[PDB]
Amino acid sequence: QSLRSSLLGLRQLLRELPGDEAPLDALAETVLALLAQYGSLRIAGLYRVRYDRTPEPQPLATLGEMPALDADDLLVRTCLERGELVSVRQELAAVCVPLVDTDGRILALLAVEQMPFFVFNERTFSLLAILAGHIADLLQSDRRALQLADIDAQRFSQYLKRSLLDARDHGLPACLYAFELTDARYGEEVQRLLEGSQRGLDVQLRLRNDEGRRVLLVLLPLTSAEGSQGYLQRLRILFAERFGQARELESLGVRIRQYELDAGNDRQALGHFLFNECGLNDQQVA
Template sequence: MRESRAHPSVPMADTAVEAHGWLKWLEVVVVTGLFLGSGFWLRPQDPLHVENTFAWPVLAPLLIGLRYGFFPALMSGLLVLLVAGWQYEIAMVSTYPWGWAAGILACSLLAGEFRDYWERQLERSRAVNDYSLQRLEEFTRNFYLMKVSHDRLEQQLAGSSGSLREALRRLYGELSQTQADGLNGERASLMLRVLARYGQLQTAALLPVSGQQVGPEPLATIGDFREVPASDPLIHYALQERTLVSVQTEFRKHLKKLDTELLVVIPLISSGGELVALCAVKSLPFFSFQNRTLRLLAILSGHLADMLCQRDETVDGSHEWQNLCFQARRAARDAEQFDLPSVLLRLQVEEQDLATLQERMTGLLRGLDVIAVDRQAGAPCVVLLMPLTDELGLAGYLHRLELDIRESTGRSLWAFAVKQTLVLRQEEQVSGWLLREDGASD
C-alpha cells in the first residue's frame, strides 16, 4: 500500500507547478477585468478614467507587475489598452488618449522591471547563501573528521616525550653519568627505563645474551614480568634474525600456532655487530604498538648497545676522536638500516688557524653533534659529525659558520679552510673517509 501511494507523488508535483502557471495568467485576467469592470460599473460615462484626475485602471497592471514581473505586467497593460481602443471605437471618438496610454504602459513596465530586478537580487542572494551553506557543511564534516583524527593522534602519542633527536640527546646524557663498564644491573635498569619512556612499555625485561644464549635471569624488569623460557619462539627468532621481531609483523600469518606471551623482542646490537642483550616486551598500550614506535625502539636499542661496547673499541687518537669514529659508524648503520640522514664534515686548516676554527665550530654545536680534531695524517683537520641532518641542514650550518667567522675574525672561512663532506649511506664508507683514503675536496 505504501509503494502504491509513493509513485503518484511526482505527477502531483508537476500538476501543482502547471496549476500555478495557469493560476498566474488567470489572476492577470481576473484582476485586470475586475478593475476595468468596476470602472464600467461606477463611471459608465468614463469607465477608463481618461478625463479623471487619476487613471485608476493603472492599478491593475501595477499590481500584476509587482506580483509577477515584467511580462505579465505588459500583458495586463496591453489588455487595458485594448479595452480602451475598443471603448473609443464604440464611442466613435477620433482622438485616442495616447498620453494616458503611455502612462498606463510606463507604470506597468516600471513595476514589472522593479519586481524582476529584486527577484534577480533575491536569487543571487539565495545562490550565495546555498553556496555558503554547502561550504559550511563541508567545513563541518572536515572539522569533525579532523577532531576525530586529532583525538586519535592524542591517544596515539599520549605520554610521548619528544622526537628522535631529543630521545638520543637524553639517552647519551643519562647513560654518560654511569661509571661502571659493561652491562650490569644499574646500566640495564637505566636502559630499560629509557626504552619504556619512549616506547610506553608497561611490562618488559632486559635479558643478557652471551653468544647465542640468553641468560636465565633478567638484569632489569618493568611491571609484573614473569620468567620467559629461552625457547620462546619470538626470542629464538630474534636471535636468529638479529633484528626486532613482533607478533604484529613476522608471525602474523602463524599467530594461531604461536605459543608466546611476548609482543615484541628487541635485540641490542652494536655498530660492530655484537649482540649484548634482548629487550622482551609483554605489554604496551595499543596505540604504541605500531611501526613508528617499534622503529624508534630499534634505533634506541642500537645506540644503547653502542654505549655498552664503546670502551672496548680500539681506535688510535684522542678520546674525542675515538668517540666521533664510533658515533659515525652508528650513524652510518642507522642510515643504512632506517634511512636516517647523517653527514660528516672535514675542514682542513693550518696549525695557526686550528684553535680559532675549533672554537667557532664548538660554539655552533647542537645536542647530538660530535666534533674532534684529527692530527694523524698531514695538516690538522676539524671533523664534525651531524646525526639526523641532511645536505640542506649541512648547508645551513656552513652558512652560519661562515657568517660567525667573518664577524669574529674578518676573514672568509674558505680563505684558509678546505672542505670535505660525506653523506652517510653505508657503514663501509665511514672508515675509509675518516682515514683520509679519499682525499677529494668539495
C-alpha cells in the same frame, strides 16, 4: 627529535656514573623507560644477554606485571639467532628487540608481552630497533682503554659506523664536513674555534691531509640536510664573532667539503669522499 636528546640524556647519565660497577645494571630502569616511552609499551622486561647469545634469566628492570622467560621461546630464540627485531604474526611473546652494538655484539634483550595494537606496527618496530642500537653503542663504553687508538679516534669510528648502519637499515640521515685550513696564519685559531663549536653527539677528528694541511672532520649523526644547513649557519655566526663581521669564513683560508650519507649512494662513495677527495687515509679513518 627527542631521539638525539634522549640519547644525549642517556649518554650524560652514563658519563656521571660512579665508574666502578656496570652501565647495563646501573641504567637498566632508564633504558627500559626510554624503550617504553618510544614503543608505548605496557608489559615488558630488559635482560642481559651473555657473550654466547643466551639470555640471562632474571630481568634487569620490569614494566607492568611481567612473567619470566619460559625456555628457548621461539621469539626469544630467533631474536638472538638472527640478531634482529622479531615480532609475532599480527593475526594473533609480542616483540623481542635485541640491543646490538656496531660490532654485532648483543648486550641486552627487550622482551615485550604487551603494547597497544594500534602501535604494534613496522613504524614502532623501526623506532625500537634504532633506539636499541644506539643504546647498545653508548653502553659499549669499555675495552677501549685496551686499544692503542686515541679515545677520539675510537668514538669517531663507532659513531660513523652507526651512522652508516642507520642510513642502510633505516634511511636515517647524517652529514660529514671536512674543513680544510689552507692559510697557516689562521689555521690553528680556526681549528680551535671549530673544536669549541662541537655540540651534542657530533664527533670530530683533528687531521692532516696528504698535502700537510690541517683538516677538521666533523660527523653529524641523525642530521638532515635541513639542519646541516642550520649547523653552517650557526658556525658562520660564530666565525663572525671570532674574526671580522667584516669577514667571511673563506677569507681565513677555510675550504669546506661536505658529504651526505645516503643508502642510495654507491657503496664506495664515502671512501671516495674521505680518501682522495679530502686527501685522507685508512690509518686516520676506519
